[PDB]
Amino acid sequence: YKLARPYIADCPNCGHSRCDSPIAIEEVRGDAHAGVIRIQTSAMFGLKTDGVDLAYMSFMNGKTQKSIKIDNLHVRTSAPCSLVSHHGYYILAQCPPGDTVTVGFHDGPNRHTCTVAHKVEFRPVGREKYRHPPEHGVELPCNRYTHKRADVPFVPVKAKCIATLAPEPLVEHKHRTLILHLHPDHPTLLTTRSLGSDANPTRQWIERPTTVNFTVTGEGLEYTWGNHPPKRVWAQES
Amino acid sequence: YKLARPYIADCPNCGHSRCDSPIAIEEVRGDAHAGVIRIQTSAMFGLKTDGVDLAYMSFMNGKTQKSIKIDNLHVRTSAPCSLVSHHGYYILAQCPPGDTVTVGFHDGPNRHTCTVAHKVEFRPVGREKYRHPPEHGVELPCNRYTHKRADVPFVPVKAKCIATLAPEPLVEHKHRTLILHLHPDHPTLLTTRSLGSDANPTRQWIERPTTVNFTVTGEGLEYTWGNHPPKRVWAQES
Amino acid sequence: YEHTAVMPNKVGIPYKALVERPGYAPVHLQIQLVNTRIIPSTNLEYITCKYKTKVPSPVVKCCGATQCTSKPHPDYQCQVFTGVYPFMWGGAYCFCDTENTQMSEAYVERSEECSIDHAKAYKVHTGTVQAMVNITYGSVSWRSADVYVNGETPAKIGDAKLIIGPLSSAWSPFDNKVVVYGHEVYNYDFPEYGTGKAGSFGDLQSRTSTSNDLYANTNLKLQRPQAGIVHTPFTQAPSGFERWKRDKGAPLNDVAPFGCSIALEPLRAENCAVGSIPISIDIPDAAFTRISETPTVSDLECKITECTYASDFGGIATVAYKSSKAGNCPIHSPSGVAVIKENDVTLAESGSFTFHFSTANIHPAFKLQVCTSAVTCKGDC
Amino acid sequence: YEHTAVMPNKVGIPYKALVERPGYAPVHLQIQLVNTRIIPSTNLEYITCKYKTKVPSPVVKCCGATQCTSKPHPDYQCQVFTGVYPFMWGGAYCFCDTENTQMSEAYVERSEECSIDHAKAYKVHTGTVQAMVNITYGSVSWRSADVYVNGETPAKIGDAKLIIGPLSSAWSPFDNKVVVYGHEVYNYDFPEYGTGKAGSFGDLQSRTSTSNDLYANTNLKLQRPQAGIVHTPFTQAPSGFERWKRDKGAPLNDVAPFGCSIALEPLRAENCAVGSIPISIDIPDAAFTRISETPTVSDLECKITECTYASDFGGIATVAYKSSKAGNCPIHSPSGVAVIKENDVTLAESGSFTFHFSTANIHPAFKLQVCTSAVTCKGDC
DSSP states (O other): OOSSOOOBOSOOOOSSSOOOOBOOOSEEEOOSSSSEEEEEOSSOEEEETTEEEEEEEEEEOSSOEEEEOSSSOEEESSSEEEEEEEETTEEEEEOSSOSSEEEEOOOSSSOOEEEEOOOOOOOOSSSSOOSSOOSSSEEEEEEEOOOSOOOOOOOOEEEEEEEOOOSOOEEEEOSSEEEEEEOOSSOEEEEEEESSSSOOOEEEEEOSSEEEEEEOSSSOEEEEETTEEEEEEOOSOO | OOOOOOOOOOOSEEOSSOOSOSOEEEEEEOOSSSSOEEEEEESOBSOBTTBOOSSOEEEESSSOEEEESSSSSEEESSSBOOEEEEETTEEEEOOTTSSEEEEEEOOSSSOEEEEEEOOOOOOOOSSSOOOOOOSSSOOEEEOOBOSSOOOOOOOBOOEEEOOOOOOOOEEEEETTEEEEEEOOSSOEEEEEEESSSOOOOEEEEEOSSEEEEEEOOSSOEEEEESSSSOEEEOOSOO | OEEEEEEEOOTTOEEEEEEOOTTBOOEEEEEEEEEEEEEEEEEEEEEEEOEEEEOOOOEEETTBOOOOOOOOSTTOEEEEEESOSOSBOSSSOBSOSSSBEEEEEEEEEEOSOSSSSEEEEEEEEEEEEEEEEEEEESSOOOOOEEEESSSSOOBOSSSSEEEOOOOSOSOOSOOSEEEESSSOEEOOOOOOSSSOOSSSSOSEESSSOSSSSOEEOOOOEEOSOOSSSOOOOEEOOOOHHHHHHTOOSSOHHHHOTTOOEEETTTTEEESOOOSEEEEEEEOOGGGSOBOSSSSOEEEEEEEEEEOOTTSSSOEEEEEEEEESSOEEEOOOOOOSSEEESSOOEEESOOSOOEEEEEEOSSSOOOEEEOSSOEEEOOOOO | OEEEEEEESOSSSOEEEEEOOTTSOOEEEEEEEEEEEEEEEEEEEEEEEOOEEEOOOOEEETTBOOOOOOOOOTTOEEEEEESOSOSSSSSSSOSOSSSBEEEEEEEEEOOTTSSSSEEEEEEEEEEEEEEEEEEEBTTBOOOOBOOBTTTTBOBOOTTSEEEEOOOSSOOOOOOSEEEEOSSOEEOOOOOSSOSOOSSSSOSEESSOSSSSSOEEOOOEEEOOOOTTSOOOOEEESOOHHHHHHTOOSSOTTTSOTTOOEEETTTTEEESOOOSEEEEEEEOOGGGSOSSSOOOOEEEEEEEEEEOOSSOSSOEEEEEEEEEOSOOOBOOOOOOSSEEESOOOBOOSSOOEEEEEEEESSSSOOEEEEOSSOEEEEOOOO
16 A cells, blocks of 8 residues: 555566565556656555655565655666655556666665566657656646645656657648658658548658648648648648 | 334225225235235335334324234235235235235224225236246246235246146157147147247147147257146157 | 268257278268357347336316316326316216316326336337357267357367258247237237327337337327216227237247247247258367278178167168277268168177167168168168 | 538538529629648557566575566566575675576666556547538638538538548558557557567567556566676567657558548547548528529629639739629639639629639639629739
8 A cells, every 4th residue: 555665576687696585566657648656565665654745655675664755765667767756555657668677776785676677658649659748748648647645646647748749840832733752850750641532541750841742622631740730721722 | 224104094995984994005016927916006016114023013093103023914815815925114914916905904794995096007918927826837038026025015927837737738749740749727828939940930729638739840849738838849750 | 080970950850971091991970969059149129018007087067167187197188178077067066067167087007017017019120140050070969159140259068060051030929029928929020119099009119118209109098088977988998918928829939830939038049950051070180080991891781689669760780790900980871761860870890789870660661871882781661 | 591512621612503593693602711620439359568677586495496476567577596696795795696586677667657658459440530621602701610420410501511421531540450649640450459569569478567467578587697697687679659659650640641630539630631521501691692692793804913823812903894783693703713702792882892712723714704894804823
């Protein structure tokens, strides 16, 4: 539980010559379309002796049940991770690569770190990648978790996740032809299909200023660009 | 536990200058091809002052809500009815149609009866319509009621309930042809089909010693001979 | 070893065959389709069931109009009738004449029995077919395997490994719309889920019976109030479900041609004898013996001791022979007048091997085959 | 008055027509397909989703047999290995080798994100097709109405009572077996819950994969236990769900040749350009003349102020005239290079009517007809 203290658990592998550690990870969620991972494990962040906090953790060090302020004691996946929220039994962190989940104490004479293998992937829900939402670009659906302690448990939900935007898509209308001068600064998936009884069935990932001419039968075309909300025309002016 | 108790009530049909009666009924279900009837009464058996018994009733007999053992509160269709189980609010007795259930006081030279009419739909739903349960022969589709209490109402059920019959047809298999020498003492619905691939969809009602020849595929045939559900015969040649 | 045969769907009747293979001693094969269940995917369209009409006492307002209050009961119908009762008696005492108004309401509900004493409107789309396929290989007649007849998984169950190439329905006595009585099916069309109709099946409609969700038409038609009493009179034409209920001639459950005993919850046709089921039968070498260059069977004669025609397996007959080596030989007769049940004969000289056969002819004359020797058998049925 | 017309799903040309009736001047009909939702009924066959891998510590019995015990999980796989590790602890782990036996176990589990990052296998039974059919009468347009194809939901808007019969083409990438991931739909085969799929969707199978105790075919093949570490090693064929998700090189959503935005749950193809829509349209009698065609239109000239080359309704033009009597008169142009949006003009002795028109040509020369008299209009598109 959230208020229940960490305990030793099977994982007889650490990077030092002491390996009598906690951590075995009861459950993990990280099959999100966000970048964040919710971990349920013994070696609990979000729990000190005061119960549930947002910036303190507790752990068995290998044999020492205690709490500390987060110093040189780091969560990682396949890369360092800076936590986002701590919720007792649950850890919540931003961990960009995912996959393996590593909780470790990088203390002195006994330096334990357990890693547990898991399939934690961050993938498109549409066709735009997610692996670490920034704060710049269009918000789009994703799976995520609540990011403040409810002491209820952290469990999957869907929230909104930022994904990169691209420069102005310069459209040029002509007769029965729509050339799209597109100017990505970043990988955009350009999908087109006509909004006529014709088609433009062209998926391509594009980067950098290019032109792409498409047919229009007199019923325009839909082009989704970057998996950002579609830019669509229905005219024969297109 | 029942939430209602008996009361004096104006009867739907009672003898004139006696319509200001005690003992009355609310609703009855008789949609069953079962001989038993489920009653929602206000002249309740299965209710004493203590609630549910199996051989006690309560009534407001032009008196007050009080109980005695079955004696003065009688169920009838228009002739006696013997209860099977009492379940508080709902009573169960056999009064076969369930379209007429009569609660009546049968003491002294006078014959007092209140009778209640009900909104039952008793229809075919089986493979044939048939006589109410006797003791003899094989059952046929019914929609019986539970015959014990759970203390509130008896539950609706579909099962099969008893039917009279007479000696089953003397079957003779011979070259691709099956004669059924029949001896009904009672009307039987005879339904046939071959079970090989020959349709023979033949309904007939039969009574009296007669013969009925049927074709066979040589790969069995069903003859259902009323007051039984499908009976089937088979062989390399039938 | 795989031997591929096609067995007729004859419920309880084995389709007798000989498995011939050289460099081995041929194996007894009778495959009996014990049961075929065509089970199709069921979209419940609606429940319809035996309603109970409820006629409550009508709301009469003396000296004022009465307005109907709708109630969700399936074919709830009201009508407001004005000027019902003049000064004093008329069926109610009222001072006012024209201002007296009765709202006459009545309705149908579900009865208490309406979820088990109900008919069911089902749409049927393509199914799965299970088949209980009893495979005899050698003397032992129980190498039986349940096997999907539809395309899912091969039977590796049973000692005789059966694959039935795909067949989603071997015969559905269920059309796009099929009516179930409550256990019996009649193909009968009706319009999809909604409000009932008093001229077609489904006088109450909606995918559940609760007398709220149920929307019905039973043709309740209010009539002018009774004169001498306050009452709600109505006429109706027979409900479409009720008209359908009086149709019970020749249900597919009792008349379907192959003995398809239609059973209900997901609709399915149990114990059909429809079609023939391709069976690829893994009959191992263990029900044969190596070669028949020395498990040769020679100087064979058949005497039939007894037979009964028009029986399942009323033939009893004996083969005397000499064999040069022991084996397992199929004693099958692919004759049409008799086919052998126990299509196996334990080769080993003894002058008698008793094989059981099935017949359909008054004289049992079948050409009986062991591995290498063929004979003609004779007796009297 | 019923007039039954069929509108092309083209917003380039909204399909303009005239409703004739004897002793009357025609009625404005302009029909635009605003939105199309092809919605079929979906019966879920199975879930497939992102698993999370669980690696437990393996049960090793030193100097004794260990047989695998099934522990139910979606891709539970074990293999029993004897000779697990070298002799003694000088080569690591256990005295014995021959007697020493390890069950090397590992599995995949559900994430609780198998309900929000999963694809869905659907069997598809017969649907409904919506067409949002906008029928314009006079300057008023909006009568834009969806109607279910099954005859269960007709548009009973009085001035354009629309029943939408089956659309000539209804874009369904919702075939017999269809997998939908997100918006992205892929036609992909699957059994009801039969054989596994490895290196494609059906990596996890079962009607829910947000629970454990499933059937998988990720094709995990355990290798001989590595010596010097407690580990359960494996080789595998590629993870099929993820591989199938990465086989987006043309999902039907993204190549939809009608520009349909495929959306998930009953499944639907939103805002298509698919087909032509049968419409039975109840024309309002109010949009014809009084009782007689009796308007006469005389002394006409037509001026086009603007047009845009081949447009939805980019034509703006005015026809000046003198009109007599009163009716409701058609201001349509039957021509093909332009058809007029406005197909009614409220005749009441009107002398100027500004009409909006649609074209499919780079020049607007259309013959526009008023009640009686017609002229030709010109400008530039």
